[PDB]
Design an enzyme around this catalytic site. Structure first.
Site, short mmCIF file in Angstrom:
data_model
loop_
_atom_site.label_atom_id
_atom_site.label_comp_id
_atom_site.label_asym_id
_atom_site.label_seq_id
_atom_site.Cartn_x
_atom_site.Cartn_y
_atom_site.Cartn_z
N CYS A 225 3.50 1.50 9.73
CA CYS A 225 3.26 0.37 8.80
C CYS A 225 4.62 -0.17 8.35
O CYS A 225 5.60 0.60 8.30
CB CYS A 225 2.34 0.76 7.64
SG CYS A 225 0.64 1.22 8.14
N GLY B 153 2.41 5.88 9.86
CA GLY B 153 3.83 5.66 9.57
C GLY B 153 4.37 4.46 10.32
O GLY B 153 5.53 4.13 10.08
N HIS C 139 0.84 -1.23 0.00
CA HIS C 139 0.00 0.00 0.00
C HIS C 139 0.86 1.27 0.00
O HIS C 139 0.30 2.38 -0.16
CB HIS C 139 -1.10 -0.06 1.09
CG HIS C 139 -0.68 0.04 2.52
ND1 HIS C 139 -0.22 1.21 3.09
CD2 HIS C 139 -0.68 -0.88 3.51
CE1 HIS C 139 0.05 1.02 4.37
NE2 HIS C 139 -0.23 -0.26 4.66
#
Ligand SMILES: O=C(CC1CCCCC1)Nc1cccnc1
Length: 305
Positions: free
Chosen positions: A145, A143, A41
């Site tokens: 991730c 952030g 993503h």
């Protein structure tokens, strides 16, 4: 003596966290040998997240569209490909700090440590359980991730989790390091239902054994039970049922304490029926299910890495 929710030492994983940037979307990536793994993503704009076509989006992208910084360094991307829900970025430099490691897909109830990161820099470390519904109750901001979960079995880092998303419910979903979701989640910003979450009964049993080791013995009683009568009571209180494998796993704690598993289940039974009545166990007013029988043994034996 004493008993804390311990994480694994984080050193070996800190040297693998990098910052990955595609367009203006920046998040964390894992650099092992000459490959950077991250949530696919990263290639989405916020508009794109409602209904991403990842194949179509990834084709507009080229090696040089991707910025991988390792602190003061930039790495050079020379191949890119999608494995399920992860991006594998082949880079010019094998990580000199690549530990001995493997990729493992874990089961519900297993525990692991999370190194929470932002812009590829480590923030903190905590221990958590993979819930029976395949979610985790973590601590992640924007952030975070690409933050990973890991176990250490002496010197070998086993990677089991990569963080992809918060659910509208505020719990956390992501993938193994082959990019397959734990649970029925998709990396799309839509309403998605976690299951009913159950209590990990075998972990609560491991933790009552830990209490007994550490002198806290009040909940032990004269009574006993069979598996079936136990499992009947467990289901009423949304507890996972207990099998023979589970009894086999508890045997060392049963040998170390001189309390039969079935006798411990009898004590657990009474607590679900009567509660704590105001009391505590290892300084908690609830029943804790985030320690495996391996964690309990490791912490009560002092096993290092
Ligand atoms: O939930 C996400 C990523 C999703 C991935 C799918 C598309 C929408 C964004 N971000 C996040 C994670 C943890 C804490 N805060 C924010």
């Amino acid at each position: 003596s004493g008993f804390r929710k311990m994480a694994f030492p984080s050193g070996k994983v800190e040297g693998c966290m990098v910052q990955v940037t595609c367009g203006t979307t920046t998040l964390n990536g894992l650099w092992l040998d000459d490959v950077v793994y991250c949530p696919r993503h990263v290639i989405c704009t916020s508009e794109d997240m409602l209904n991403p076509n990842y194949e179509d989006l990834l084709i507009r992208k080229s090696n040089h569209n991707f910025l991988v910084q390792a602190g003061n360094v930039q790495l050079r991307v020379i191949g890119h490909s999608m494995q399920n829900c992860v991006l594998k970025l082949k880079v010019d430099t094998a990580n000199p700090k690549t530990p001995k490691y493997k990729f493992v897909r874990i089961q519900p109830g297993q525990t692991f440590s999370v190194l929470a990161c932002y812009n590829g820099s480590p923030s903190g470390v905590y221990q958590c359980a993979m819930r029976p519904n395949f979610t985790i109750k973590g601590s992640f901001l924007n952030g975070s991730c690409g933050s990973v979960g890991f176990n250490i079995d002496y010197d070998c880092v086993s990677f089991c989790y990569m963080h992809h998303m918060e659910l509208p419910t505020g719990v956390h979903a992501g993938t193994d390091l082959e990019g397959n979701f734990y649970g029925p989640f998709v990396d799309r910003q839509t309403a998605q239902a976690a299951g009913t979450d159950t209590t990990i009964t075998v972990n609560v049993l491991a933790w009552l054994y830990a209490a007994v080791i550490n002198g806290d013995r009040w909940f032990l009683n004269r009574f006993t039970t069979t598996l079936n009568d136990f499992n009947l009571v467990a289901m009423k209180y949304n507890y996972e049922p207990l099998t023979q494998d589970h009894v086999d796993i508890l045997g060392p704690l049963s040998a170390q304490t001189g309390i039969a598993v079935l006798d411990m289940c009898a004590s657990l039974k009474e607590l679900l029926q009567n509660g704590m009545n105001g009391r505590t166990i290892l300084g908690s007013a609830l029943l804790e299910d985030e320690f495996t029988p391996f964690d309990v043994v490791r912490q009560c034996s002092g096993v290092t890495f």
